[PDB]
Every structure is written in C-alpha cells, then in structure tokens.
C-alpha cells in the first residue's frame, strides 16, 4: 500500500483517470468525473485514501489536486465543448479561502476555452464543519459564473434535506451500494420528488448491476454512473459508446412499467364494475341504515376487503366502520363522526370523483391501525356520499 | 435557577402536561410530560437542567424520574386511552440499553397503564452512539406495544434514511421553522410517512396559519399555546372540540376550493388548446415541426417550451422555446426521451385513458429554474402534446401558484 511521502516524492507520476456518466435521454455520455490516480511500480493506484487522510496537511492534498486538474482540464481543452467536468471538492478546504484561488483556476480556463457552466462541482455537506450558511452564500457566488453544484452521499451521517434543499443544488448524487429494509424505494421516490419540486437533477452513482440501474431510471434518474456503465479509465469514450445496449435496457424497463401501470388501472375497472354491480343490487332495497348497507356489502365483497365506511363531500364519517378481523367482520359504531379531510389526497378524490363520476384506487399506503400496506378505493354514491374500501395486496 | 438549587429541592418539583389533539374527533387523545419546579413562589421549567451538558447523567435521571412517578401515577386515574408522551434523550436512554427505563415502564403496566399508551419522543441526532444499536434497542420497546416517536424532524433531523430505518410510529415536525426549501422538504417527509405508516405531530402551533398548514399537510396531531399551554392538571377531553370543529370546516372549505380554482381554470385552458390545435390540424400537410411552431404564436401569451413525444416518450419534434419574448426553434431536442420522469409514463396512460388533457402539479423547470406547470394534452396516432407555462402567466391567473 502507498504511503503519503510516495506520492509527494514522485508528483509528476500522478495522473487523472476518468468515468463517465449516461445521460437517460440520448443514452450518451455528457460528461467525465475525475478521479486521481499515481503510477506506482508498474501500476496504477487510486489517490482515494490520500485524499480522504485527515492526518495529512491540507497543502499537500492541494498541491496533488492541482496537478490532477491541470491535466484533467488541458485534456478537456482538447475534447468535445459540450462535456460536463464533474470534480471532486471538499467543502472545507474549499472555504479556506472562500473558495477564491479555486474559482481563479476555473476562471483561467475560461480564457483557455472552457465554458463555466460545464463545471459540476461535487460537494459533501454533511462533512462541513463550518457555519453552513456562509458554505451556501459561496455557492451561491459561484453559481452566478454558471457553475454547477452537486451533492454526494445523501442521507448518511450528519447529512441533512433541510440543509441541502438550501443550497438548492443543480444535481443530487445517490449511490445504490445502499440497494445491495426491504422499502428503501419509499426512500428514492421521496427523494426524486423533493428534487422534481426544487429543480435538481438526480444522478445516480456505483451502479454494479442492472436491477440497480433499473431502480434508477423509475425513480427519476436523469443521469447514470457505475462499473456496471463503465470503469473509470485513462482516457475518454466515444460519445454514443453505449446508446444501443442502454437504447435496449431502457426500452425494456419502460415496458415493464407500462404493462405494470395498465395492468393496474385494468384492475381497477374490473373492480369498479364489481362495486357497481354489488352497491346497486343491495340499494335497490330497504336498508334505510347507511349501515345496514356497508355490512352487506363486506359480506359480498369478504374475499377482497378488509374495511369499508362511508363518508360526506366534506370528509365526514357518515356510518362506522365494518372491519374484517380473524376472517370475521366486526362492527365499530364509535368511528362514526369522525372527519378525515386532513388525510393526504382525500379533498381531492372527493372532486376527483364527482368531476369524474367514476370510482378508483389510491397507490399503496400503510394503514394507521394495522400497519401493512393496503389500498383504499374510493366509489361515489347517489346524495352526495362517498365510500371508501379498504384491500390489502393481491400483489 | 442554579442545578444545585434543583436537587437540593427535589420534593417541589412536578409535572406540568400539554394536551395534544386529534384531527378525526378534535379532542384530547394524551398529553406530553413537562418537567416543573416550585421555587420561591413560583413556577419554573427544568428544561435548562435537563439540556445542560455539564450536569452528570445521574442526577438528571434522579429528577426525570420524580417527575415521571409523579406523572404516571396520575395517569392512573385518568382516563384509560390517553397516551403518555415523554421525553427522552437517547445517550442517557442507552447507557444501559433501556434496561432500568423499561423496568419502570413494566412496573406500571402492574399497577395498570398498558404499555401501547407510552409514546417516547426520541431525538435521533442527538444521538453519538452507534445508531444500528439504538435503532436495535427500540425494536425491542415496539415488541411491547411501546410507540416512538421522533423530534426536531423537519429541520434539526431530516435524514429520510435515518426515517426509514427506525420505522418510527409518529413524527413531530414544529413550526416556528413557519413555498421555500423547506416547506418542499416536509413534503417529501409527508409522502414517506405515508408510505412507511408514521403519523404526523405537529408542534410549536402558536398561530391560526400554522394550524392550517398543519392540518392540510397531512397533520393528525396537534400542539401548541395556540392549542392549549401546559398545565398542572389534565383538561375535560372535550374541551376544544366544537372550536376545533368549526376551525377544521373552515379550512376544509378553502381546499375544496382552491382546488376547484386550479381544475376550472385547466378546463378552459384545455378548450383553449383543443380550438388552437384542430384549427391548425384541419388542413395542413406540414410537419409536425412546423405546427408546433405555429402553436407556439397561438398561445404565445401562456407557454414557453411546446414539443411532441411518442407512447414511449420519445421527442417527436425539435422543441420550440420562447426566449426574451421571442420563439427560437430548437432541433437538438429531437429523439430525446422522457419516460425517466416522474409521473411522464402515469400520465401518457391517464391522457389515453382519460381522452382529456390537465396541468401537472408545480415544479421548478430543469433550465431555466423558474417554478413552472405543464400541460399535457392528447392527440390522434398516439402521440402526446406538451406545453410548459411560465410564472408571468401562473402568477396573473387565479390560483395556480
Ligand atoms: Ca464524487
Ligand atoms: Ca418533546
């Protein structure tokens, strides 16, 4: 293994490697992270470990640093002009100076001939130790060249979405060594639509193997890096190295998704009609009780439902619940009078449903009491009423 | 009021309680444990005490636990359904692996308070301890019924990680933090704890505003002076329930509302666009290009970006994007595809389905950063038709921001 004082001593030995990232849309390459490596004996071995060393003096991480990027950026010069050069950059050392000698060597390139606003500067904030707000002021300073932010490591030690929605990245870094709790998907989706509503594009990093790349693409990866894509090597690609075999991985996921997203609304029509024919078959009749009526129902619907009540346009619980329990159904007259308009989505399936004049499924959720994840159908009625019925799977 | 002054006085101290209330009943359903002490004719919190990191964990505990006996035995008498919420640091918590904790939690199980009435409010980043050995010890509390709750979510802990593992059963968001980052940031928490089965508490409810904001996002639990001030003795459970009542119907009102405002309004808009596109349509051999571009100068008032795209969600045309007040043609953005995007697939089946065209939800456009709505509107030989409205049209109609 390599000592600090090897690769001091022999500084003009190191030397940039580079990986590329695919872009979901043209299943191209957009742009190069730098990554930096030494020739060692006959080898080449990564400067990780000297980077990440918190014993060595910060100097001598920058005076590496700059070699790399002297000669990672000279080879820029010389590539396509519209290539993004992502780069590794520790917030500490970068505030310093406020950042200042840095944007210089940026700002020199520019003459040299590289746009500012194809610098993505790859930032970890959970590992800043100074005041954040004055981090998020810099930025701020250098995004007003171009210059693009981005954020690694989300979610894993001091990290924090208050902090990084502030700095309002252009990019977020997820890394799905985490892929290998079964709902860490919940985590993803969550996280894409935090970055849909702020304008930060998801890049997903240390993608070794496809069904990873898969939960990329449906979770709102716009951009692709990994092994898995390609390893980091010494020189630059052909810029559609890719398309074709991604042109095809890609295709089949989006068939995938697609059978997926018909063969549940499908579902939900047929059941649609079975509610339908149920509700105005037992409606026809002398159920007066609004909950004489639901237990019927459960009993026509037992193989299938679990819950089911009804409630008024403005959320409030016309009947109690008919709960099945143990393979019996029970009546709970006390949830009567309860509202649930503060419950995420129900005002607007209650418009949806008029507007529509239809009945539909909500995606899954957990439920409050018995904790497994269930969907709810939601069914419009005569006198402006509405029943909800609760299903747990059937996958 | 000196630490020495505390101990010395441990027979005054007691607890005061803060009610905290339901969105379903709008009535009491437990009260959070405060810790109080008499001095000199007054009243006073031992949260200085309890926050003080110079005093040593030993005498921290002696207090918490006056107040915790006293707290319980009166819960004793009180009504049987109330849920407990106390207090808890985690490092004191894991000193001994909750052991002695749960000891006297288990006593008053005996006594007759059944242990799915305790809820524990956790700070987690607080927290130093290896995090897997505490999220391992709460397990073993939720195996009793024990509920847990996490604080200072929001801001102080905003870990959706963190989140998912301890798989808490409530989360407290407070709201003096009171759309910025962070309102989009409680958003994505809301959705997960959907998703993972965790219900939302909020706290710090010192206004009307916050209330609401509580409440339409998601809020099943509620608390603050706004609510009622902690007291020395528990509250008729009732006590808020018709204010309550009439507060909720009234923000219950406004959403049916503001969400018919935004519905009407993509009604017309769709009409506006179904005129636009079949009189440019009807006889006209030009590509498919060249009828974005003439769009584009149709409604030039309300779009800034317009193309086409396939089922599949590839770009059939270039993209015409309006720039300085002027239309700029742009073919690059031919043959690029979508269906990486949230919602683009779902919506292209609902178009289908649906036969009708809607707005998407606000969001902040990839270029130009400016919070933004897209039209997603149908056409004949499956394909799509997608127009991209800016603020300066959002922001002069009614409701859509
Ligand atoms: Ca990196
Ligand atoms: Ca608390």
């Not at 993004?84 to 003459?111: T, V």
């Not at 890096?225 to 991604?246: A, C, H, I, M």
């Amino acid at each position: 293994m390599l000592d600090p004082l090897d690769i001091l001593t022999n500084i003009d030995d190191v030397l940039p490697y580079y990986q590329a990232i695919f872009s979901a849309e043209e299943q191209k390459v957009v742009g190069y992270e730098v990554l930096g490596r030494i020739l060692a004996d006959s080898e080449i071995q990564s400067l990780g470990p000297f980077f990440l060393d918190a014993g060595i003096p910060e100097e001598y991480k920058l005076e590496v640093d700059n070699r790399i990027i002297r000669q990672a950026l000279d080879r820029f010069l010389e590539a396509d002009s519209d290539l993004l050069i992502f780069m590794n950059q520790d917030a500490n050392l970068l505030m310093l100076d406020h950042g200042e000698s840095f944007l210089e060597l940026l700002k020199e390139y520019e003459a040299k001939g590289i746009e500012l606003h194809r610098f993505v500067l790859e930032i970890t904030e959970h590992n800043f130790e100074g005041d954040i707000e004055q981090l998020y002021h810099m930025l701020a300073y250098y995004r007003t060249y171009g210059i693009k932010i981005a954020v690694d490591n989300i979610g894993k030690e001091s990290s924090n979405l208050d902090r990084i929605a502030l700095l309002s990245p252009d990019l977020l870094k997820i890394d799905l060594q985490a892929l290998k709790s079964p709902s860490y998907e919940h985590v993803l989706y969550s996280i894409s639509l935090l970055a849909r509503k702020i304008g930060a594009a998801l890049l997903y990093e240390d993608i070794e193997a496809n069904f990873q790349l898969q939960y990329a693409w449906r979770n709102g990866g716009r951009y692709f890096q990994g092994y898995y894509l390609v390893s980091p090597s010494e020189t630059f690609l052909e810029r559609d190295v890719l398309k074709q075999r991604l042109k095809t991985e890609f295709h089949q996921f989006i068939t995938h998704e697609k059978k997926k997203l018909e063969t549940v609304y499908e579902h939900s029509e047929q059941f649609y009609k079975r509610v339908h024919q149920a509700v105005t078959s037992l409606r026809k009749n002398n159920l007066s009780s609004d909950d004489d009526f639901i237990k019927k129902l459960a009993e026509e619907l037992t193989d299938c439902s679990f819950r089911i009540y009804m409630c008024d346009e403005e959320g409030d619980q016309l009947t109690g619940n008919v709960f099945k329990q143990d393979g019996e159904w029970i009546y709970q007259p006390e949830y009567a009078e309860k509202n649930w308009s503060w419950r995420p989505y129900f005002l607007e399936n209650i418009m949806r449903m008029r507007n529509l004049r239809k009945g539909f499924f909500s995606d899954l959720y957990s439920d409050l009491e018995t904790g497994e994840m269930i969907r709810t159908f939601s069914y419009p009625m005569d006198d402006q009423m509405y029943l909800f019925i609760d299903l747990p799977y059937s996958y």
